[PDB]
C-alpha cells in the first residue's frame with residue numbers, strides 16, 4: 872500500500888541524508904514557489920501508524936490544520952516536509968521517530984518509537 876511504497880520508493884529530503892523523512896509527490900502543485908519560514912501554512916492531512924491504524928485526519932474535522940512554518944510548532948518532519956511543497960501539492964511522507972515523537976510517543980494513539988505515514992495537501996501559505 873501507500874506506506875510501503877513511500878518506504879521503498881521515496882526520496883530522502885533530510886539535510887543530514889539520514890533517510891529519516893522520505894517523500895513522494897502525488898500531485899504536482901502550482902509554479903515553483905514553496906513557503907518561507909514563518910509563513911502561515913494551511914494543510915489537510917491524514918496520518919497512519921505502522922500497524923495500519925488511522926490516528927488523525929483534518930478532513931474528518933472539516934477544517935484545515937494551520938501552523939507557522941519552521942517554528943517547531945509541529946514535528947520536525949512536518950517543518951522539513953511542508954517547506955518542500957508547492958501550493959496545491961499533495962505529498963506522502965514516511966517519517967522515522969527521530970523526526971516525529973521519538974521514544975516518548977504521544978498519547979493517546981502514538982506509541983514509542985513510531986514510524987509515521989502522512990498524506991499532506993498544502994492548501995495555501997501566507998506571510999503575516
Ligand SMILES: C=C[C@H]1CN(Cc2ccccn2)C(=O)[C@@H]2CCC[C@H]1N2[S@](=O)c1cc(Cl)cc(Cl)c1
Nearest residue numbers: 918926927928936944945946949977978979980981
Ligand atoms: C493538532 C495535531 C498536530 C499535533 N502536532 C504538534 C503537537 C503539539 C503538541 C503535542 C503533540 N504534537 C504535530 O506536530 C503533528 C503534525 C501536525 C498535525 C498534528 N500532529 S500528528 O498528526 C498528531 C495527531 C494526533 Cl490525533 C495526536 C498527536 Cl499527539 C499528534
